[PDB]
Structures are given as C-alpha cells and as structure tokens.
Symmetry: C3
C-alpha cells in the first residue's frame, strides 16, 4: 500500500516533468490509452488527443507544474485521490502564477504500472465572483490561458 | 531490510505526509470540520503571535477563512523526526490567493509541528506558522503589501484575535 | 530497498530548502559532498567552504521559501541522478513574488549511510518567445535580489564551459 503510494507520487512527478520539458509523448504516456484530462470542463480523451494538447501547450507555455499535497486511496489496481496544483509561467514581466487548483484523479494499475484514467483540474475561483476567470485577469497570463483553452476546445468536448 | 526500525519510521513519515496533505485539502475546500479533525482535540494553530486552541475554535477559524479566501495551501519540503507515537518537524508553506487581478502569493513561510499518533492516526498537537518577512524591515508584515492580499490578511488576523490568545513570548 | 532510498533523497531535498531558508549556511553546505557543487545562471560554486559563503551571502538579502516538488530520481547503488521542480518565493516591499521557477538536475552520492549532493544544477524556466531573456530580472523587485546573488556567485564561483 505504501509502495503503491510512492509509485503514484512518481507518476504525478512524471506528469509534471514531461509537460514541463515539452515531452508530449511522455505526458500522454502518463494516461491510460483511453484516459482523459479535463479542464475548464473540456474533456480531452485518448493518448492521440492528449499528445496534441501537450504539443499545443509547448508552443505557448514555459513554467513549472507543481503537484503537492498528494492524498490517494488505493484498492487493488485502482486508486482515487486529490492533489494541489500550482502552475507558474515565465513572462516578459517575470514569473507569474498561471494556475492554482486541485487535481481530482482516478488511477489504474495496468499490467504493473499506475496511469491516469481520469484527471480533472479544478482551478480556484474568486470567493465573491465564481463566474470570473481568475487566470485571465493578468494580461501576460491571459493570452496564454486563451491559447490553452482554445486547444482544449479543438481537442475535447464539454460534457 | 526488513522492516527495520528506521524503515518503520519511513512508513510513519508517509502517514505524516498524508496528514499534511489532508490539512491543506480540507481548508482549501472549506471543510472546517475536516480541517479541525487534523488536530488533536486540544491541538493548537499559532500564527502571528496568536494561538487558536481546540477543535471548536479551529473549526470557527476555518469557517472565517472560508468566508474570505479561495486559493491553495501548498505544503512541501517535509522533514520530520519520529519518536514512537510523537513526531516533530518542519515543512514549507506557500499559499496562493485568487484575486480579481489574478493569482497571487498570500503567504510564504514554515510550519513547525508537534504531532501525536493515537488510535493509529497522526494528528497535529501543535502547528506554528512563521511567515517570511523582509530582511531589511522585519517589523513589516509582507502579506499586507498588495491591497487585494492585504484585506484578506486583515480578516484572518481579526479571526485570530477573536478566537485565539496572544503568545507569551 | 529502492523505495527507502527515494524517501531518504526526499529528506535531503527538504533539508536543502529548510537550511537555506533559515539562514543555516553550515547546514546547507552539509547537504553537499565535500567537493560538491551548485550551478546556476552559468556559474558553478564548488566545495563546502565556498557553498557556505554563498549561503551566508544569500541570507543577507533573501527571505522566502524554496519549494522542491515533483521529485524523480534513478538510484543505482550509492549514486542517484534525478530531477525536481524548483519554485522560489521572495518577500518584497510589493508583496510576495516568484524569484525562481525551474528544474534541479542532480547527481547524488550516498556515503556513511547518508545521501548528499555531488552536483546540483538549477536551470530556470525561459521565455518561449526569447530564450536569451533572464526572466528572474524582468521584475525589478526580484532583480534587486538576483543581482546580489550573482555578485556572490561571481566572487565565489567559476563560469561554465
């Protein structure tokens, strides 16, 4: 059980290190063949689309994905859990916070290896206006947010 | 091997990591009951010279926090010494805040913890947050520097003043 | 077992951040091997004496947090190579800001039952639109401190090949 927790930590680390090094093949490889990444409600399903998403991401983003606060429950070859996500971005005005939120994950151990079946990212909203996109409020950041959202719209479907 | 004494200490460390994660994930989803449940029944949280003691006051603090904050508490760099059913350690705290101007850093500092294991579960007996200050003017609270940020800081310090008591040192 | 080594490496990474962030330069240099090195911004600082001096210079001008997360290490006996994410906050008169965002690229060695850093390179994240730009000096509040850190590196280290 403890070893599985360390394996899941390693998976989360590889998810960040692959996307942050523009390794879209490796990023998609963190998911099951038919796995999904959901953000801002758009569900991007399957390695082919996931790889396209990472490629689009690579064109417009440099920064760090930080995954911390990992809390997973494992039963046999399935696990679910949550973790905190903070994403930085390199801008001409310095390093800014592109994203802050929570991953909600369903993981599957298939033939020896943990992979992401479903990862939902929920980004934090204003307490007083859960309609406002906080990630577009700063202008440097806003253009990048636009590109990522556009990629999700071209590659996913909204539920 | 096998499992040796220090190996057992590492399994306790993973358990403590999970407690730290729970602490963050509960407050960040406005689960004040879950948050207070990370502490012992007479556990305390200290920040800025104020100590909030006991689950009921801790629950009220979380509820006050929920009214004014959306953001993430990140806890990283965990380093704990386990001695049977007690542990002491430190970890890094960075706290983000969703603002009308974008995501900002609300807080940065260190947790200094005293933990107790009861009924097979680790909980926080005492957690002290020390926030990072200006090297040049350590009197200044750095949280109050940005105006969005500063209002949230004021609300949290007010909750602490209503729910806690001032430290003796 | 490989997994206990990973936890030990995690604790070394934690110690690195907690020492520097509490102005414990001896402690910080003690995370490295005796002739271990730290590389950043094209400068390499080598050996505990110089690393201690670096940490002391750092303490004079920085208050903030080094976060290390996303740790991924390959352990082969008493050596390991790996990567982790670095985000560094800084207390400024305009609030907390991000001083650094990048990747640590590490070569670790285990001796006397303890892992230490033989070589750590910090590679900060670059602008996609212009890799020549030093993003850590784009914000004036942050650049002020970077300048002091680079002065210490210039005094204590050697430029890379």
């Amino acid at each position: 059980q403890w070893i599985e927790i360390l394996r899941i930590q390693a998976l989360c680390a590889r998810y960040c290190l692959t996307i942050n090094t523009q390794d879209g093949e490796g990023w998609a490889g963190c998911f099951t063949e038919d796995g999904a990444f959901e953000f801002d409600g758009w569900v991007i399903r399957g390695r082919p689309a996931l790889r396209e998403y990472a490629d689009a991401h690579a064109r417009v983003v440099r920064g760090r994905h930080l995954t911390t606060d990992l809390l997973y429950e494992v039963d046999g070859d399935v696990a679910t859990g949550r973790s905190a996500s903070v994403v930085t971005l390199a801008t001409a005005a310095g390093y800014k916070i592109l994203g802050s939120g929570e991953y909600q994950d369903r993981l599957i151990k298939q033939d020896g290896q943990w992979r992401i079946a479903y990862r939902r990212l929920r980004n934090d909203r204003l307490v007083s206006d859960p309609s406002v996109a906080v990630n577009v409020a700063d202008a440097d950041v806003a253009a990048v947010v636009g590109h990522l959202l556009a990629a999700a719209r071209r590659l996913g479907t909204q539920m």
